[PDB]
């Protein structure tokens, strides 16, 4: 058999031969009279045997199958826009029989062609176009996988997305879903009077987050810049400036390991809303997420395959209202035991109480075994695994929530929630800090662990930030869950890949 | 008078004392019953003298002016959402007289306060809220500029945008316009069946563009990455994959000088459309841009100040159809002269004809004086300066358009256009190249003048349909539609040379 390299060499020669022969297989243009989708909807009503010799139309697409029948009849499987239309190339209906031979002899599977012909339906009842003229618009120089075998190797799909999209329609449907999600988010927030904003992705200071950053050098400034991890601080500065409702769906950057659940660049949505608290955002999140799912999917009911198409299937019910649980209470109810008072979560006596609880319940916790990390491990093992449907986990302790405002009624807790779906977090929200002295404390304590402080942002707080609530969502993970992908590369058009 | 640092120290102490005194001026929250804008529309019908003791409402905002009248009556100018509402704090109407004294003594200009009170209108006819209780929500610890004097120093405005927004409402309107522009573009393209996509901003190779790049090191990969200059190559790979219409409104990065018209990161919109040429995109561009202007501004007519509010004012008429000019033809018509044949633009004698023409018409052109650069200077001096209204400049010569497909009818020209507004280009479009050998040639020529995207060459070897591309600088469009002669005016947080 021919191998891929020999096929590519032979076909490049043929196309080169077409050029020198005055038949350049890359012509200036091909105006399409109608899309394949319109053609199918406009002419699906025809009866087996029909042929409209009175209507000539120009369509185009890519050849996926070429089946010769008798030598004066050829069938082409023409694909585009996720649909398919048969080209019944019948010599007697072509411009001329000599040209009919000439065009069929040059066309191969994968070629992009333009078809000018008549609508019709075969005797078997297959909607077809009877071509008067076929034009090779762009040839496929490479050998495509066997028809019906397709492209299944994930590494190849992710490194050649164009090939994945040529062969796999479900991949096209995935990225349509992803775009619909972002579009839906903008519609929802725009209708609530939020201003969609653009803030810097390059900053002079890295800031207090533990995340390892991308560093780049600015030659004109003789200075280093750091790629952003979140737009948070710029958004609140705009809230200080009087823009009460702001959101940004943008790229963030993390300089860490690349694998199936980690990409160096990713997409988040953050919004900040003056004079709201986390209960306001909870109601906002419920309506947005439930409405998104029903609008894009058709139902509140969604099935998801955490381990792959052949693995277990989980039914995820987005029917509002979402289940609401308070972290400490449900953790007590799930353990079947009373935990210490919430204002005692900083004493060492409660730390070992929790340490013992992890020992007794075989809950893994690597060092440091702090109260915060032990609680976090216990919650993930007793409360997050339970959250298959969308579930708000609420009122986290302060010792686990440094950035959030304190709870008004309950000592030691904060005004915070996390929305969990399929055991994973999909958005974070809490009432923000607006005391400039408290913000300076947090920046210094973050800096102490690093070894910077955003003095500009501290100054902005000194001018006055109103009470504000913040919200953040990972778009990629939402896209995974709504495209039934157990992998982040499935929802990234061009995922970062560890080089060959 | 007190200087700003002494004011900040005195007010910080006072707020600290409020804390230790159990009246923390940062309370958890303040629920607003109604926005200032809704309040104004709902209660502007009231009569001078009215006071609705039958309605209690909670509003909030920032104090911009505090004028005491007699000691039991104080007026506060409360601002928010770009609007303004007066608080007529009347002691007889407050919760209690001691609390009324206590709250007014702590409030200063700039403080964010919550007001619970009754709608009403004073005898002068000013819509007001009669407070039953005022709450300090966040104090302004810094001295603000004198009322009526505001913030005018551009450098200060750009380094403290929050302060610029506090003091200058026109700045708020500008960035509302900017968001409307991006939103309008998405609306237009989505309705034409375009898929809004996200393509990588980090790549392993810089690519052939002359642009100076940002380089960053990936530790886990032990490799350098380059910040993108355009998403072009990823979009066409998606068109190869069968997604015929794609667009991306995203950030690009250039590592060059920072000044009033240059920022290291900026926003463009690119889209690619299978089976279209530049005439298709010309009609698309006309409808999008004209419709955008009328939708956001209310008219096709826009006024613009290239040199500032006190300088010359230009009327820019976006009424379709836009004027269309063919570069070589109008350059001949404008020069009053016949140029050489369009297929002779590579001979040295045609280069010297043009060199002489620039000498005779005093058109500055620095070396190298190639045919391409001499034409470009002549076009900018004779054809682009005239383009005040939106004007399509079309059919550029091949010698000036390496990325564009060749024109079938006119030898030496390409299938290309540029949309010019106020003498500046705002979008470029042409019929793309899809011959994989030709793209490889272009990549090789780009590489010698310094790389080759082998992956993108392979994708073309699988087959790219005839496709047309389109690109627009959002920032420059935002400038022209917010009457800004400066890029920092349309960037929320512009890059700034270190103090």
Q: What is the 3-state secondary structure (H, E, C) of A184-253?
A: HHHHHHHHCCCEECCCCCEECCCCCCCCCCCEEEECCCCEEEEECCCCHHHHHHHHHCCCCEEEEEEEEE
Query: Are B54 and B174 contained in the same domain?
Result: no
Contact A112, A150 (CB under 8 A): no
Q: At A172, list the tokens.
A: 């096209």
Bridge partners of residue B470, in order along the sequence: B271, B429
Nearest Cα residue to B271 out of B237, B248, B242, B239? B248
Query: Are B171 and B113 contained in the same domain?
Result: no
| CA triple A369-A373-A378, angle to 5 deg | 105
Query: Are A365 and A239 contained in the same domain?
Result: yes
Q: At A385, list the tokens.
A: 């695994």
Q: What is the CA radius of gyration of chain B?
A: 30
Residue A436 lies in a domain: yes
DSSP designation for A325:
E
The CA-atom distances, in angstroms, between B54 and each of A363, A466, B40 are 59, 28, 17
Query: Are A140 and A171 contained in the same domain?
Result: no
- Whether A216 and B216 lie within 8 Å, measured CB to CB: yes
**Residue B255 assigned ligand-binding role:** yes
Rounded Cα gap, residues B495 and B485, in angstroms: 17
Give me the residue from A196, A258, A462 closest to B179, CB to CB.
Answer: A196
Q: Using CB atoms within 10 Å of the CB of residue B234, give its burial: 0 to 12 exposed, 13 to 18 middle, 19+ buried.
A: buried
Query: Are A202 and A56 contained in the same domain?
Result: no
Rounded Cα gap, residues B255 and B248, in angstroms: 21
DSSP designation for A10:
H
Where does A101-148 show beta strands of DSSP type E? 112-121, 127-138
**Residue A157 assigned ligand-binding role:** no
With contacts defined as CB-CB under 8 Å, which chain B residues touch A431?
A: 28-29
The CA-atom distances, in angstroms, between A473 and each of A88, A224, A324, A406, A418 are 50, 29, 18, 22, 10
A169-191 vs A475-482: helix crossing angle, rounded to 10: 130
Contact B388, B422 (CB under 8 A): yes
In sequence order, the 6+-apart residues with CB closer than 8 A to the CB of A410 are A342, A395
Is A328 in a helix, a strand, or coil? helix
With contacts defined as CB-CB under 8 Å, which chain A residues touch B195?
A: 175-176, 179
With contacts defined as CB-CB under 8 Å, which chain B residues touch A460?
A: 160, 162
**Residue B432 assigned ligand-binding role:** yes
DSSP designation for A257:
-
Residue A235 forms contact with B (CB below 8 Å): no
**Residue A97 assigned ligand-binding role:** no
Q: Dihedral of CA B292/B287/A191/B42: which sign?
A: positive
Is A127 in a helix, a strand, or coil? strand
In sequence order, the 6+-apart residues with CB closer than 8 A to the CB of A486 are A305, A306, A307, A308, A480
Q: CA of B133 to nearest chain A CA: how many angstroms apart?
A: 17
With contacts defined as CB-CB under 8 Å, which chain B residues touch A498?
A: 221
Q: Please give the torsion angle defined by the CA atoms of residues A438, A441, A446 and A447, in that order, rounded to the nearest 10 degrees.
A: 140
Rounded Cα gap, residues B118 and B34, in angstroms: 12
In terms of phi and psi (left: phi > 0; alpha: psi -120 to 50; beta: otherwise), the region of A196 is: beta
Domain count, chain B: 2
Q: How far is CA A49 from the centre of its chain?
A: 45
Residues present in chain A in total: 500
Rounded Cα gap, residues A75 and B348, in angstroms: 54
DSSP designation for A500:
-
With contacts defined as CB-CB under 8 Å, which chain B residues touch A435?
A: 26
Taking a contact as any Cβ pair under 8 Å apart, which residues of chain B between 320 and 339 contact chain A?
none
| CA triple A99-A104-A109, angle to 5 deg | 155
Q: CA of B40 to nearest chain A CA: how many angstroms apart?
A: 17
- Whether B242 and A82 lie within 8 Å, measured CB to CB: yes
Residue A494 lies in a domain: no
Bond into B278 cis (ω within 30): no
Nearest Cα residue to B128 out of B37, B32, B40? B40
- Size of the A and B interface in Cβ pairs below 8 Å: 274
Residue B408 lies in a domain: yes
Query: Are A102 and A36 contained in the same domain?
Result: yes
DSSP designation for A499:
-
Rounded Cα gap, residues B492 and B175, in angstroms: 8
Which residue's structure tokens are 């989980």? A314
Q: At B448, list the tokens.
A: 């010698």
Query: Are A433 and A387 contained in the same domain?
Result: yes
Rounded Cα gap, residues B109 and B128, in angstroms: 18
Q: CA of A403 to nearest chain B CA: how many angstroms apart?
A: 14
Q: What contacts 24+ positions apart, CB below 8 Å, involve A344-352?
A: A344/A412, A345/A371, A345/A375, A345/A397, A345/A398, A345/A399, A345/A412, A346/A371, A346/A399
Query: Are B106 and B212 contained in the same domain?
Result: no
Nearest Cα residue to A432 out of A456, A462, A467? A467
Q: Dihedral of CA B451/B455/B461/B466: which sign?
A: negative
Rounded Cα gap, residues B128 and B104, in angstroms: 17
Bridge partners of residue A226, in order along the sequence: A203, A215
- Whether A172 and B464 lie within 8 Å, measured CB to CB: no
Give me the residue from A62, A199, A265 closest to B242, CB to CB.
Answer: A62
Taking a contact as any Cβ pair under 8 Å apart, which residues of chain B between 337 and 396 contact chain A?
none
- Find which of A141, A201, A242 to mutate to test the B interface (most B CBs within 10 Å of its CB): A242
Bond into B174 cis (ω within 30): no
- Whether A408 and B28 lie within 8 Å, measured CB to CB: yes
CA atoms within 13 A on the CB side of B54: 2
Resolution of this model in Å is 2.5
Q: How many CB atoms lie within 10 A of CB B187?
A: 13
Rounded Cα gap, residues B79 and B75, in angstroms: 13
Rounded Cα gap, residues B30 and A466, in angstroms: 9
Residue B442 lies in a domain: yes
φ and ψ at residue B245, rounded to 5 degrees: -130, 115
Q: How many CB atoms lie within 10 A of CB A291?
A: 16
Please write down the HEC assignment for all residues of chain B.
Answer: CCCHHHHHHHHHHHHHHHHHCCCCCCCCCCCCCCCHHHHHHHHCCCCCCCECCCCCEEEEEEEEEEEECCCCEEEEEEEECCEEEEEEEEHHHCCCHHHHHHHHHHCCCCCEEEEEEEEEECCCCCEEEEEEEEEEEECCCCCCCCCCCCCCCHHHHHHCHHHHHHHCHHHHHHHHHHHHHHHHHHHHHHHCCCEECCCCCEECCCCCCCCCCCEEEECCCCEEEEECCCCHHHHHHHHHCCCCEEEEEEEEECCCCCECCECCEEEEEEEEEECCCHHHHHHHHHHHHHHHHHHHHCCCEEEECCCCCCCCCEEEECCCCCEEEEHHHHHHHHHCCCCCCHHHCCCHHHHHHHHHHHHHCCCCCCCCCCHHHHHHHHHHHHHHCCCCCCEEEECCEHHHCCCCCECCCCCCEECEEEEEECCEEEEEEEECCCCHHHHHHHHHHHHHCCCCCHHHHHHHHHCCCCEEEEEEEHHHHHHHHCCCCCCCCCCCCCCCCCC
Nearest Cα residue to A199 out of A265, A255, A276, A251? A251
Nearest Cα residue to A267 out of A278, A254, A279, A276? A254
Residue A77 lies in a domain: yes
Out of A75, A110, A144, a domain closes at A144
**Residue A248 assigned ligand-binding role:** no
**Residue B462 assigned ligand-binding role:** no
Contact B481, B185 (CB under 8 A): no
Nearest Cα residue to A392 out of A419, A431, A424? A419
Please write down the HEC assignment for all residues of A392-423.
Answer: EEECCEHHHCCCCCECCCCCCEECEEEEEECC
With contacts defined as CB-CB under 8 Å, which chain A residues touch B110?
A: 463-464
The CA-atom distances, in angstroms, between B185 and each of B196, B300, B319, B355 are 11, 17, 18, 41
Q: How far is CA B476 from the centre of its chain?
A: 7
Taking a contact as any Cβ pair under 8 Å apart, which residues of chain A between 437 and 496 contact chain B?
456, 459-460, 462-467, 493-494, 496
Residue B173 forms contact with A (CB below 8 Å): no
Rounded Cα gap, residues A274 and A231, in angstroms: 16
CA atoms within 13 A on the CB side of B484: 23
What DSSP element (H or E) covers A303?
A: strand A301-304
**Residue A351 assigned ligand-binding role:** no
Sheet with strand A215-218: strands edge to edge = A202-203, A223-227, A215-218, B215-218, B223-227, B202-203
Taking a contact as any Cβ pair under 8 Å apart, which residues of chain B between 143 and 162 contact chain A?
159-162
Q: Dihedral of CA A117/A118/A123/A125: which sign?
A: positive
φ and ψ at residue A92, rounded to 5 degrees: -65, -20
Rounded Cα gap, residues B32 and A25, in angstroms: 67
Q: What contacts 24+ positions apart, CB below 8 Å, involve B377-385?
A: B378/B331, B378/B335, B378/B354, B379/B327, B379/B331, B382/B331, B382/B334, B382/B335, B383/B325, B383/B327, B383/B330, B383/B331, B383/B334, B384/B420, B384/B423, B384/B425, B385/B423
- Whether A202 and B265 lie within 8 Å, measured CB to CB: yes
Nearest Cα residue to B328 out of B307, B343, B316, B318? B343
Residue B24 lies in a domain: yes
Which residue's structure tokens are 């002269």? B337
Query: Are B194 and B288 contained in the same domain?
Result: yes
Rounded Cα gap, residues A309 and A485, in angstroms: 9
Give me the residue from A27, A220, A434 closest to B256, CB to CB.
Answer: A220
Sheet with strand A245-253: strands edge to edge = A195-196, A245-253, A265-274, A468-474, A424-431, A416-421, A391-394, A323-326
Q: How many CB atoms lie within 10 A of CB A193?
A: 12
Which residue's structure tokens are 């790549």? B203
With contacts defined as CB-CB under 8 Å, which chain B residues touch A463?
A: 110, 140-142, 162-163, 166
Q: At A411, list the tokens.
A: 């000592």
In sequence order, the 6+-apart residues with CB closer than 8 A to the CB of A129 are A39, A57, A59, A78, A85, A86, A87, A88, A115, A117, A118, A119, A120
Nearest Cα residue to A479 out of A212, A71, A185? A185
Residue A221 lies in a domain: yes
Residue numbers after which chain A breaks, C to N beyond 2.5 angstroms: 451
**Residue A310 assigned ligand-binding role:** no
| CA triple B108-B110-B114, angle to 5 deg | 85
Residue A176 forms contact with B (CB below 8 Å): yes
Q: CA of A164 to nearest chain B CA: how many angstroms apart?
A: 7
Domain of residue A179: give its range. 167-482
Contact A97, B312 (CB under 8 A): no
Residue in chain A closest to B474 (alpha carbons) equals A198
Query: Are A428 and A357 contained in the same domain?
Result: yes
Q: What is the CA radius of gyration of chain A?
A: 30
β-pairing verdict for B127-138 and B83-90:
parallel
Q: Please give the torsion angle defined by the CA atoms of residues A50, A53, A57 and A60, in that order, rounded to the nearest 10 degrees.
A: 60
- Whether A238 and B190 lie within 8 Å, measured CB to CB: no
**Residue A454 assigned ligand-binding role:** no
Rounded Cα gap, residues A323 and A321, in angstroms: 6
Query: Are B226 and B143 contained in the same domain?
Result: no
Residue A7 forms contact with B (CB below 8 Å): no
φ and ψ at residue B310, rounded to 5 degrees: -90, -5
With contacts defined as CB-CB under 8 Å, which chain A residues touch B82?
A: 242
Which residue's structure tokens are 């992908």? A485
Nearest Cα residue to A371 out of A387, A384, A352, A390? A352
Contact B244, A35 (CB under 8 A): no
Which residue's structure tokens are 């159990």? B22
Residue B365 lies in a domain: no
DSSP designation for A92:
G
Give me the residue from B175, B253, B498 closest to A223, CB to CB.
Answer: B498
With contacts defined as CB-CB under 8 Å, which chain B residues touch A199?
A: 492-493
Longest dimension (CA), chain A: 93
φ and ψ at residue A317, rounded to 5 degrees: -100, 110
Contact A302, A483 (CB under 8 A): no
What DSSP element (H or E) covers A7?
A: helix A4-20
Query: Are B424 and B296 contained in the same domain?
Result: yes
Taking a contact as any Cβ pair under 8 Å apart, which residues of chain B between 245 and 264 contact chain A?
250-251, 253, 255-258, 264
Residue B14 forms contact with A (CB below 8 Å): no
Contact A171, A151 (CB under 8 A): no
Q: CA of A142 to nearest chain B CA: how many angstroms apart?
A: 6
Give me the residue from B32, B237, B277 closest to A162, CB to CB.
Answer: B237
**Residue A111 assigned ligand-binding role:** no
Query: What CATH number is given to the structural domain containing B403?
Result: 3.30.930.10
Q: CA of A12 to nearest chain B CA: how many angstroms apart?
A: 9
Residue A498 forms contact with B (CB below 8 Å): yes
Residue B204 forms contact with A (CB below 8 Å): yes
The CA-atom distances, in angstroms, between A140 and each of A11, A58, A104, A268, A473 are 8, 21, 15, 37, 41
Give me the residue from A201, A257, A460 closest to B265, CB to CB.
Answer: A201
Q: At B276, list the tokens.
A: 């279209």
Q: Using CB atoms within 10 Å of the CB of residue B310, give its burial: 0 to 12 exposed, 13 to 18 middle, 19+ buried.
A: exposed
With contacts defined as CB-CB under 8 Å, which chain A residues touch B415?
A: 28
Query: What CATH number is given to the structural domain containing A69?
Result: 2.40.50.140
β-pairing verdict for A83-90 and A127-138:
parallel
Is A136 in a helix, a strand, or coil? strand
Which residue's structure tokens are 């270190």? B498
Contact B395, B373 (CB under 8 A): no
Produce one character per residue of B191-211: b if its CB has 16 or more CB atoms within 10 Å, e if not.
Answer: eeebbbbbbbbbbbebbbeeb
Contact B369, B376 (CB under 8 A): no
Rounded Cα gap, residues A184 and A190, in angstroms: 10
Nearest Cα residue to A489 out of A170, A155, A145? A155
Contact B117, B132 (CB under 8 A): yes
Q: At A113, list the tokens.
A: 């062609």
Contact B90, B72 (CB under 8 A): yes
Q: CA of A381 to nearest chain B CA: how many angstroms apart?
A: 30
- Whether A138 and B464 lie within 8 Å, measured CB to CB: yes
């Amino acid at each position: 058999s021919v191998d891929p390299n020999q096929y590519y060499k032979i076909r490049s020669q043929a196309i080169h031969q077409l050029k020198v022969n005055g038949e350049d297989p890359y012509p200036h243009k091909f105006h399409v009279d109608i899309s394949l989708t319109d053609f199918i909807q406009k002419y699906s009503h025809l009866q087996p045997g029909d042929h409209l010799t009175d209507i000539t139309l120009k369509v185009a697409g890519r050849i996926h199958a070429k089946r010769a029948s008798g030598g004066k009849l050829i069938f082409y499987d023409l694909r585009g826009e996720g649909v398919k239309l048969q080209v019944m190339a019948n010599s007697r209906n072509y411009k001329s029989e000599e040209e009919f031979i000439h065009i069929n002899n040059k066309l191969r599977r994968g070629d992009i062609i333009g078809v000018q012909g008549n609508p019709g339906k075969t005797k078997k009842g297959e909607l077809s176009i009877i071509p008067y003229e076929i034009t090779l618009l762009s040839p496929c120089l490479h050998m495509l996988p066997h028809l019906h075998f397709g492209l299944k190797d994930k590494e190849t799909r992710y490194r050649q997305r164009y090939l994945d999209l040529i062969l796999n329609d479900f991949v096209r449907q995935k990225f349509i879903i992803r775009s619909k999600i972002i579009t839906y988010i903008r519609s929802f927030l725009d209708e609530l009077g939020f201003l969609e904003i653009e803030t810097p992705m390059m900053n002079i200071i890295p800031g207090g987050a533990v995340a390892k950053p991308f560093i780049t050098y600015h030659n004109e400034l003789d200075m280093n810049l750091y790629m952003r991890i979140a737009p948070e601080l710029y958004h609140k500065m705009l809230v200080v400036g009087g823009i009460d409702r702001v959101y940004e769906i943008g790229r963030q950057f993390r300089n860490e390991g690349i694998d199936l659940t980690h990409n160096p660049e990713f997409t988040t949505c953050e919004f900040y809303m003056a004079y709201a608290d986390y209960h306001d955002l909870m109601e906002i999140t419920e309506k947005m997420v439930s409405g998104m799912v029903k609008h894009i999917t058709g139902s509140y009911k969604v099935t998801y395959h955490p381990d792959g198409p052949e693995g277990q299937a989980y039914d995820v019910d987005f029917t509002p209202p979402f289940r609401r649980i308070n972290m400490v209470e449900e953790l007590e109810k799930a353990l079947g035991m009373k935990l210490p008072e919430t204002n005692l979560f900083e004493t060492e006596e409660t730390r070992k109480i929790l340490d013992d609880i992890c020992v007794a319940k075989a809950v893994e916790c690597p060092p440091p075994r702090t109260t915060a990390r032990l609680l976090d491990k216990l919650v993930g093992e007793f409360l997050e695994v339970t959250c298959i449907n969308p579930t708000f986990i609420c009122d986290h302790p302060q010792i686990m929530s440094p950035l959030a405002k304190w709870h008004r009624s309950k000592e030691g807790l904060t005004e915070r929630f996390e929305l969990f779906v399929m055991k994973k977090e999909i958005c974070n929200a809490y009432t923000e800090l607006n005391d400039p002295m408290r913000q300076r404390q947090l920046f210094e304590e973050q800096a102490k662990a690093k070894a910077f402080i955003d003095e500009n942002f501290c100054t902005a707080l000194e001018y006055g930030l109103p009470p504000t609530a913040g919200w953040g969502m990972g778009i990629d993970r939402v896209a995974m869950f709504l495209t039934d992908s157990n992998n982040i590369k499935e929802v990234l058009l061009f995922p970062a890949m560890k080089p060959e």
